[PDB]
Amino acid sequence: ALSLTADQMVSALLDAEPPILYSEYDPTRPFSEASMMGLLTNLADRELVHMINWAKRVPGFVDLTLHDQVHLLECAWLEILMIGLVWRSMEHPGKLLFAPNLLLDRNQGKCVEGMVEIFDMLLATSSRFRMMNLQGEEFVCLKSIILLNSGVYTFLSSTLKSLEEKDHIHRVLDKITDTLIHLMAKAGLTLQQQHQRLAQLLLILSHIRHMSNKGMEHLYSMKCKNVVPLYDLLLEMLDAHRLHA
Amino acid sequence: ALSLTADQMVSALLDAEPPILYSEYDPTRPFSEASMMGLLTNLADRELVHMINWAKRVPGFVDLTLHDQVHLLECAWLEILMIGLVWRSMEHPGKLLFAPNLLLDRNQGKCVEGMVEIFDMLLATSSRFRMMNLQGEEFVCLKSIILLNSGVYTFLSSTLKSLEEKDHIHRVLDKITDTLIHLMAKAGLTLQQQHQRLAQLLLILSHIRHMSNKGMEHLYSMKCKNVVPLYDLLLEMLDAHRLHA
Ligand SMILES: C[C@@H]1c2cc(O)ccc2O[C@@H](c2ccc(OCCN3CCCC3)cc2)[C@H]1c1ccc(O)cc1
Numbered sequence: 001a002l003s004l005t006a007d008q009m010v011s012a013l014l015d016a017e018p019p020i021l022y023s024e025y026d027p028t029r030p031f032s033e034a035s036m037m038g039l040l041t042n043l044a045d046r047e048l049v050h051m052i053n054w055a056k057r058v059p060g061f062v063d064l065t066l067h068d069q070v071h072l073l074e075c076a077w078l079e080i081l082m083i084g085l086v087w088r089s090m091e092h093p094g095k096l097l098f099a100p101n102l103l104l105d106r107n108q109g110k111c112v113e114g115m116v117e118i119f120d121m122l123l124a125t126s127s128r129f130r131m132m133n134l135q136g137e138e139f140v141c142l143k144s145i146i147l148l149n150s151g152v153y154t155f156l157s158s159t160l161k162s163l164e165e166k167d168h169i170h171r172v173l174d175k176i177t178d179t180l181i182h183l184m185a186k187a188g189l190t191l192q193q194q195h196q197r198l199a200q201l202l203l204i205l206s207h208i209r210h211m212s213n214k215g216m217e218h219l220y221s222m223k224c225k226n227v228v229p230l231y232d233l234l235l236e237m238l239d240a241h242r243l244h245a
Numbered sequence: 246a247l248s249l250t251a252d253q254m255v256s257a258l259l260d261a262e263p264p265i266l267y268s269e270y271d272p273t274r275p276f277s278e279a280s281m282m283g284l285l286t287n288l289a290d291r292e293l294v295h296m297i298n299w300a301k302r303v304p305g306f307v308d309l310t311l312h313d314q315v316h317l318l319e320c321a322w323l324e325i326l327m328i329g330l331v332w333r334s335m336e337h338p339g340k341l342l343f344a345p346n347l348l349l350d351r352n353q354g355k356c357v358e359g360m361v362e363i364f365d366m367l368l369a370t371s372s373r374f375r376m377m378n379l380q381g382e383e384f385v386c387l388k389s390i391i392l393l394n395s396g397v398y399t400f401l402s403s404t405l406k407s408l409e410e411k412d413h414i415h416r417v418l419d420k421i422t423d424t425l426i427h428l429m430a431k432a433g434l435t436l437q438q439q440h441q442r443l444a445q446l447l448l449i450l451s452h453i454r455h456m457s458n459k460g461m462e463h464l465y466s467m468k469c470k471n472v473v474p475l476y477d478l479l480l481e482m483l484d485a486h487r488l489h490a
């Protein structure tokens with residue numbers, strides 16, 4: 001990512017994409033019986049496992065310390081789930097594609113107290129992506145920027161090691177910036193359109209932060225799982241051995 | 246802002262800057278006696294009045310409907326206070342310049358339950374601005390983008406009128422983008438450095454959204470004022486007559 005080309009960054013990111021998972025509920029059973037929060041909590045936990053795998057394939061991420069990888073993911077995991085949801089809902093106006101077998105509109109969100117507000121925010125992001133004609137290549141750049149950016153300002157201490165980590169991360173961010181501009185240019189945008197679209201894409205990231213903050217607030221109006229700190233589950237998934245190499 | 250030049254946008258924004266206010270506490274009295282949350286709540290309410298005046302001087306803002314002006318401010322007022330605080334704290338490492346006569350370090354934040362976490366986040370932003378060498382001209386562009394951007398994705402309905410409002414706002418955002426790139430270019434940055442710095446500046450905006458969300462959560466752990474909805478106080482300040490013209 002520091003000597004990788006833009007072309008290389010884009011293909012690495014494309015190659016790293018996690019799979020689209022299915023909701024787990026018996027499709028021969030009614031629907032009034034399923035807990036939607038149970039269905040969504042199960043889905044999200046299964047995605048998180050694959051998120052960890054993806055993150056290790058983002059250029060520059062595994063050159064970070066184990067601790068810093070945990071921090072970044074702990075800060076960004078819900079933004080990352082959310083932009084992935086909005087991305088796969090793009091071609092489904094008025095609907096959120098949680099999974100190919102689980103397509104919800106906003107009235108289905110009303111089923112959960114305070115959840116329709118979140119649904120409306122996600123739907124509105126999906127519509128903006130649609131209106132901008134966001135491309136697959138731009139999406140994977142955006143998802144990787146979220147990974148690297150969301151927690152970079154809140155590393156507590158400032159050891160030599162930590163200062164070096166922050167420099168690296170800003171360097172990778174800079175290369176992902178180069179990559180986004182390179183894509184727009186190949187796509188034929190003018191220099192002017194290039195910076196304008198860069199800004200439009202990056203400002204959306206502040207709306208996705210908003211949604212994650214609001215969702216955490218809403219998630220923390222308990223009904224899901226907070227057992228075992230999130231740091232430690234993440235740390236266990238990231239701190240792998242090399243025995244199955 | 247749609248036929249205004251970049252040079253014109255920057256001078257209008259510079260001209261619109263609100264004043265730096267003083268904290269109101271008797272400087273001949275001890276300090277253990279003052280409520281820091283009382284001191285900070287009073288300050289912030291006084292700034293808000295001047296914020297409204299500023300907002301009406303941002304190019305394109307007063308061409309919006311009264312309703313939309315209220316929505317944007319209601320969404321962005323705390324981000325706007327916060328980036329102004331970080332900006333004036335820039336040259337004061339380890340300190341937050343709430344007012345020229347009210348300079349607090351993080352231990353002074355400990356005085357308020359859960360407040361030191363917020364202080365640490367603001368301080369870290371101030372250090373990033375310092376490290377980037379953020380310039381006065383870039384700051385006023387950033388503050389205006391926050392005004393226009395933070396609430397643009399959450400206008401409920403989509404009347405013809407509302408669709409027209411959103412197009413305009415995105416157009417002004419685009420001109421503020423043009424303006425930021427024009428400043429960096431005059432400053433002698435390379436095309437490459439220009440987009441990289443654009444991205445660095447805009448990604449900071451997602452951290453300021455974070456801080457505002459966290460601060461609202463913290464503010465909502467009551468001790469201040471929630472009397473009278475925020476929409477209505479804003480609406481009263483923005484819905485002015487032209488009698489004192
Ligand atoms: C948009 C969210 C989402 C995104 C996905 O990619 C998949 C499922 C999903 O379901 C909700 C969902 C997401 C995460 C959840 O977390 C459960 C707890 N695990 C513990 C470790 C990782 C999350 C549960 C539901 C949803 C949500 C709904 C209401 C909210 O206030 C916030 C988010």
Ligand SMILES: C[C@@H]1c2cc(O)ccc2O[C@@H](c2ccc(OCCN3CCCC3)cc2)[C@H]1c1ccc(O)cc1
Nearest residue numbers: 285286288289290293326327330363460463464469470
């Ligand atoms: C950074 C904030 C700030 C910024 C300023 O420019 C000036 C004062 C100021 O004080 C706090 C402050 C800001 C806004 C406040 O709002 C009081 C209620 N009024 C009602 C209408 C406008 C806000 C009160 C304190 C602070 C804060 C501290 C803890 C938090 O969790 C959040 C913010």
